[PDB]
Design a protein around this ligand. Sequence first.
Ligand SMILES: *[C@@H]1O[C@H](CO)[C@@H](O)[C@H](O)[C@H]1NC(C)=O
Ligand SMILES: *[C@@H]1O[C@H](CO)[C@@H](O)[C@H](O)[C@H]1NC(C)=O
Ligand SMILES: *[C@@H]1O[C@H](CO)[C@@H](O)[C@H](O)[C@H]1NC(C)=O
Ligand SMILES: *[C@@H]1O[C@H](CO)[C@@H](O)[C@H](O)[C@H]1NC(C)=O
Ligand SMILES: *[C@@H]1O[C@H](CO)[C@@H](O)[C@H](O)[C@H]1NC(C)=O
Lengths: 197, 238
Amino acid sequence: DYNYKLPDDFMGCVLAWNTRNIDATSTGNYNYKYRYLRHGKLRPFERDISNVPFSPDGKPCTPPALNCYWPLNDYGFYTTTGIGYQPYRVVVLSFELLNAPATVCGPKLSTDLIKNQCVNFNFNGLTGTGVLTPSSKRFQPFQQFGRDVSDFTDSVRDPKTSEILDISPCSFGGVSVITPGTNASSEVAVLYQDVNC
Amino acid sequence: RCTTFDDVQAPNYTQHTSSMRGVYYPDEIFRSDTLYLTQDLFLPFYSNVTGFHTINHTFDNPVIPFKDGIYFAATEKSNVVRGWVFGSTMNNKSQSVIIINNSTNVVIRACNFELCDNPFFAVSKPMGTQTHTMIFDNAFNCTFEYISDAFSLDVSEKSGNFKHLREFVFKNKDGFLYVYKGYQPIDVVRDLPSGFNTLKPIFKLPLGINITNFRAILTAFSTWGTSAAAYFVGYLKP
Ligand SMILES: *[C@@H]1O[C@H](CO)[C@@H](O)[C@H](O)[C@H]1NC(C)=O
Ligand SMILES: *[C@@H]1O[C@H](CO)[C@@H](O)[C@H](O)[C@H]1NC(C)=O
Ligand SMILES: *[C@@H]1O[C@H](CO)[C@@H](O)[C@H](O)[C@H]1NC(C)=O
Ligand SMILES: *[C@@H]1O[C@H](CO)[C@@H](O)[C@H](O)[C@H]1NC(C)=O
Ligand SMILES: *[C@@H]1O[C@H](CO)[C@@H](O)[C@H](O)[C@H]1NC(C)=O
């Protein structure tokens, strides 16, 4: 982790799998190395390929002088070793929550958009629901989600047709009910929808 | 080749005020008629911006520390300051991304470059044509490669006030070099002018390299000469 740092903030998927058969040669495998000494630490998603001759004080060196070590490790493998020393090919799948125009789909067939109220819209990363409605909002081309006052996405530019449309929610509200006396009459409780009629 | 000119005059470090500059769209989210707070690396209002004034004797491109993020401006009428290196030690072993425009297209290419102490473009002063480039010679253990979309550029000498002003912001953040861009016309000789201008993103470059130092790349007008074109460097703070 002192060589490859994954941050607390941004995160993806870490994928390791065993390679006793391929990499763990019976006589040795010294193609792979890693640094074990470095001035300070590494920032996340940031590395140092360079084979800088390390010194604990900071002076430049020429080995094998006093406290002039090579940073890389003679990091070999054997198939006769235990599972804790076997090599593991690790692929780290960092994603982008930074919603640019998208790359991965995980394919579903894309339907046609409708002005109809109450559509379960599933755009690129918006599994919301509401009323798709075209809007006059400007959208400089490096932004494609619109927000109004808070957390909720107000408007989206469509990913297929680049049409600018704002989202209204499914037209909720409270139902209130007028009754006269139930002893007077069980006749129909008339209602409220706090909504456009 | 590591060709350095003889008379290299040191910068006087004429400080200027980042009046109302260094403001960019912080994320890809449209917001309409609202007030919005943001915790991110910005250029503070009225900070010290180190000017770099190029004259016939003064040749300004020192190895400037990066330090968590920089603002960049360039008063241009000949489009001189085209080129950015972002290195660790600015030598052959360290990783250094090189963002350059060679007057037809912007080319970003990160490798372990043997950085010369004096990069320059051999451009004639009355003609104004790019003949060659001598920025890099050896490029071993190359990480990143990119070629952008093409656009034309004028190189030759003008005289007077500045017509162009390219305003750039570079943020090293989780190995992603965020690059921003804005533009407005000005009229000034040497001062970084007061005024508000908003910057827009272009590149989220997946580099992952240690950026601590940087150096701009100048367009020399060729025994050398430079036209009147200054650039400005600020620092971003959280
Ligand atoms: C980058 O390298 C320099 C020297 O090469 C070192 O002082 C600095 O700590 C490094 N930065 C990071 C973030 O590792
Ligand atoms: C691809 O995008 C264009 C506009 O960018 C659009 O007109 C076209 O319909 C899209 N293709 C499909 C199959 O929808
Ligand atoms: C740098 O800025 C500080 C305030 O941020 C100011 O006090 C100082 O005088 C400035 N340095 C100059 C102008 O050289
Ligand atoms: C330099 O210009 C050429 C065409 O003039 C183009 O391929 C690109 O912009 C640059 N090529 C590089 C840097 O290899
Ligand atoms: C490039 O780096 C690799 C390890 O990343 C190293 O084995 C190789 O010798 C380097 N190339 C040089 C020094 O020319």
